[PDB]
Design a binder for these strands. Structure first.
Ligand SMILES: OC[C@H]1O[C@@](CO)(O[C@H]2O[C@H](CO)[C@@H](O)[C@H](O)[C@H]2O)[C@@H](O)[C@@H]1O
Ligand SMILES: [Mg+2]
Length: 579
DNA sequence: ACCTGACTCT
DNA sequence: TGAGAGTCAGGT
């Protein structure tokens, strides 16, 4: 039972210039959430503070906001955002153990102090799930149990900083932490806190129209089935399709009949019900997920959504986005794309500005593989899919048909995401054998890419991991598996992670560079969102001309590759219009 | 409360 | 026959 002072006032010895700090927010969504307790561990001791005391104390608040008073934390964004909602600035966080653990091995799934500490044989700290419980039973425990937990977390941070930093340095990842992921965390905190304004009235009227179209289609489906059933139950729908209407079973799921859209598209010729089911699902997804789902997470006092970017989750160095996920808002189909008309600037006379990299992943591949053909294509700023078609099919540009371009694009999608010949076969509705032929023809036209793929798979086997341009790492222990599919996937990930992960590295560095430039230029523009290869901002209408020049340049110059980077941009009165 | 299947994005 | 994030409805 670890020693500490349960303090009832802040003292000067709590305000040392180096500390482990815990500012505990237990709610999963930390926006405008309570802080339940505070712990400080430093050279003078271990301290627990009640937040109503600490956060009302001017000296404690000044210390929190003093850049020269250095703090080590776990998940500093969570604390920084919760403090922002209370009007308190957190500065001086020089070490974030969450981000340190994530960089060392994203596959460990570190999401609490205990999990990080276990990586270095430190077990004098309980998992948060053990203290707070889970789901319905989740609760803040009584003060003695809470205070000991927060102090043990602070103690672990204090003890673990040096070994984590030492391993990062050995991995050549120390700058990645201190110069890239930590500064980014502050930028993400500001994006999240600013939020995105939503035109809820427009969403509600869309919901009304959708509801009417769903009722029409649903009724059509029942008259075509000759009975009512739950269309959203793949079990009940499978009985109607495959038993009652006797449609061919072209594919199964672990549990029953497949009703995936690609299966359904093949069955459309047999019965009118099928097109109606596909339309019902399209409309229902928009209704349940992007109208109703979105409305439920808009804050009613300000009509904004405040996402949380998980910076320490994905295996490739991408962010993820939650509550709402603003990285999967519809765009491909025009009916869904209209959802974007609901995402508006937060101030009158402001506009939405969106800038995206053109083919960043294939450009990164050109650079890392040093493929002469691919590097020449991007040096000419060619349409990469048309050029890929010319090469794999050996035809001139004016002989490339739409279908040839489509198939070439699919081969390029495959390379960008590292999918298998089976995956490409499925995407193109062709045999595995034919997909393998496509892939072989690609390697004849891009032999540098082939050499890269061979060379990286050997490197992953030898080292045990692969790396990205800015030294992000992904371990691939399955590369030696005696199971063909398992090993093949690891080999694809060896090839793919440096492409996907380097693209994540670049856009992160661009975000950092852009925030610095916006401040230097005294612009009011602010970053709202990142969507993997694109950045969305809002700014006064009077700043658009400057941003047209500034934002693409900053993004294009974030790194210097053997090929140029190219950024496209658009702006308008809503996110829909920034196209 | 977790799992499955379907669907959205890059 | 693994790209992998998040969300939803249904269903054990
Ligand atoms: O605060 C985000 C940060 O916390 C973790 C747990 O360490 O994720 C928690 O919070 C997220 C934000 O709501 C949730 O999506 C997630 O389910 C929850 O565990 C980290 O994974 C994340 O980086
Ligand atoms: Mg793009």
């Amino acid at each position: 039972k670890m020693a500490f002072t349960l303090a009832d006032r802040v003292t000067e010895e709590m305000l040392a210039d180096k500390a482990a700090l815990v500012v505990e927010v237990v709610e999963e969504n930390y926006h405008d959430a309570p802080i339940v307790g505070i712990a400080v561990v430093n050279e003078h001791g271990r301290f627990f503070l009640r937040p109503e005391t600490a956060l009302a104390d001017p000296q404690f608040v000044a210390w929190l906001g003093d850049e020269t008073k250095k703090k080590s934390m776990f998940d500093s964004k969570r604390a920084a955002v919760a403090l922002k909602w209370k009007g308190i600035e957190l500065c001086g966080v020089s070490f974030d153990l969450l981000l340190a653990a994530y960089l060392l091995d994203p596959a460990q799934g570190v999401d609490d102090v205990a999990a990080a500490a276990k990586m270095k044989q430190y077990e004098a700290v309980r998992p948060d799930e053990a203290v707070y419980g889970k789901g319905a039973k989740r609760a803040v425990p009584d003060e003695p149990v809470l205070a000991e937990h927060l102090v043990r977390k602070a103690a672990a941070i204090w003890a673990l900083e040096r070994p984590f930093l030492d391993e990062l340095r050995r991995n050549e990842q120390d700058r990645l932490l201190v110069e890239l992921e930590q500064p980014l965390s502050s930028i993400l905190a500001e994006m999240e806190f600013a939020g995105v304004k939503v035109d809820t009235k427009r969403l509600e009227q869309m919901g009304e129209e959708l509801a009417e179209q769903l009722r029409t289609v649903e009724q059509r489906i029942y008259e075509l089935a000759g009975q009512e059933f739950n269309i959203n139950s793949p079990k009940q729908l499978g009985v109607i399709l495959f038993e009652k209407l006797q449609l061919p079973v072209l594919k199964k799921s672990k549990t029953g009949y497949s009703t995936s859209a690609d299966v359904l598209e093949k069955l459309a010729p047999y019965h009118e019900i099928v097109e109606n089911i596909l339309h019902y699902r399209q409309l229902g997804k928009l209704q349940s997920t992007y109208i109703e789902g979105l409305l439920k997470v808009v804050r009613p006092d300000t009509k904004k959504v405040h996402t949380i970017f998980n910076q320490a989750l994905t295996q490739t160095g991408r962010l993820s986005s939650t509550e709402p996920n603003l990285q999967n808002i519809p765009i491909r189909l025009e009916e869904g794309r209209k959802i974007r008309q609901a995402f508006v600037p937060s101030e009158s006379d402001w506009l939405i500005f969106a800038a995206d990299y053109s083919q960043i992943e294939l450009r990164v591949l050109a650079h890392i593989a040093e493929d002469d053909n691919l590097m020449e294509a991007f040096r000419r700023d060619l349409d990469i899919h048309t050029k890929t078609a010319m090469d794999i099919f050996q035809v001139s540009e004016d002989e490339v048909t739409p279908n040839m371009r489509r198939q070439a694009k699919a081969v390029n999608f495959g390379i960008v995401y590292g999918i298998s010949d089976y995956g490409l076969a499925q995407n193109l509705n062709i045999s595995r054998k034919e997909a393998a032929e496509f892939i072989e023809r690609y390697f004849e036209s891009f032999p540098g890419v082939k050499r890269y793929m061979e060379n990286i798979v050997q490197e992953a086997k030898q080292k045990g991991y692969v790396t990205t341009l800015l030294h992000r790492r992904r371990y691939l222990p399955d590369i030696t598996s005696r199971n063909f599919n398992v090993r093949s996937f690891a080999e694809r990930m060896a090839m793919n992670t440096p492409i996907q992960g380097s693209a994540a590295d670049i856009i992160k560095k661009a975000m950092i560079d852009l925030n610095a430039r916006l401040k230097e230029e005294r612009l009011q523009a602010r970053l709202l969102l990142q969507v993997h290869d694109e950045l969305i901002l809002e700014a006064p209408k009077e700043e658009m001309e400057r941003l047209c020049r500034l934002v693409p340049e900053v993004m294009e110059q974030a790194v210097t590759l053997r090929v140029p980077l190219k950024v496209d941009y658009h702006y308008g009165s809503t996110w829909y219009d920034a196209k």
